[PDB]
Symmetry: C2
Subunit: 137 residues, 2 copies
């Protein structure tokens, strides 16, 4: 089960995922390898890749939803700042990493939690959904 395989099964709902947001064009769900608790992936529903080469308006939409998720994770986990990363070296489907940021070491793929507890993910999901409801009202 490579990361790309699990990722595609989540977006296709063949494997369970912890979603926090969905649009006609964009979904967002918790990663199972979080850099910090609340680490969310913002994902176009269509298969896209190579962020810098994507149509500007399409990328703008993804980054705008990413802003909403960034506000939500800051509110949910009481942080002043949210980190944002685009890498794409593990999964060739565009996805924006958005997470509460506290330490410079939070930005780094080597330090991810490869085995987050189920309650920690449940709580991240519930807190982000609660913050989004506040922000979208």
């Amino acid at each position: 089960m490579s990361m790309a395989t699990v990722f595609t099964k989540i977006i296709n709902r063949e494997l369970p995922g912890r979603f926090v947001y969905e649009d006609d064009d964009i979904v967002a769900f918790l990663t199972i390898e979080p850099m910090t608790q609340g680490h969310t992936l913002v994902v176009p529903r269509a298969e896209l890749d190579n962020w810098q080469d994507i149509e500007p308006a399409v990328f703008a939409r993804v980054m705008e939803v990413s802003q909403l998720i960034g506000k939500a994770v800051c509110k949910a986990f009481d942080t002043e700042r949210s980190g944002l990363i685009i890498a794409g070296l593990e999964v060739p489907h565009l996805h924006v990493h958005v997470f509460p940021a506290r330490n410079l070491s939070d930005f780094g793929f080597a330090n991810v939690d490869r085995n987050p507890s189920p309650e920690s993910l449940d709580e991240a999901q519930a807190k982000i959904k609660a913050a989004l409801a506040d922000l979208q009202s």
Copy 2:
């Protein structure tokens, strides 16, 4: 000298900087602590911070220039992918990190080039500016 002080000196041309792009609203220049050669900072001229709170249209403009820079560093350094990071924990002025990316270990702050050679900066500036000329034609 703090990273914030050095950043403000570079943007105000009080330290020599390797600028690669400017328009009426945004500049881009090589960081002097690069994660990889060609690591560029995309920066609004206005005093803005906290990417997730920026007016959506203003952020979209920063993101569009970030895409242009991402195209340019991939071409200039012959890498398939560009990394993109927004952190903000060291400098409280919005700036987007855009850099050619070959390995997950490139991402983050554990191993930056803290005194890069002038030759490496000059060559990166040259190659990025040459790539930009074709891209925006």
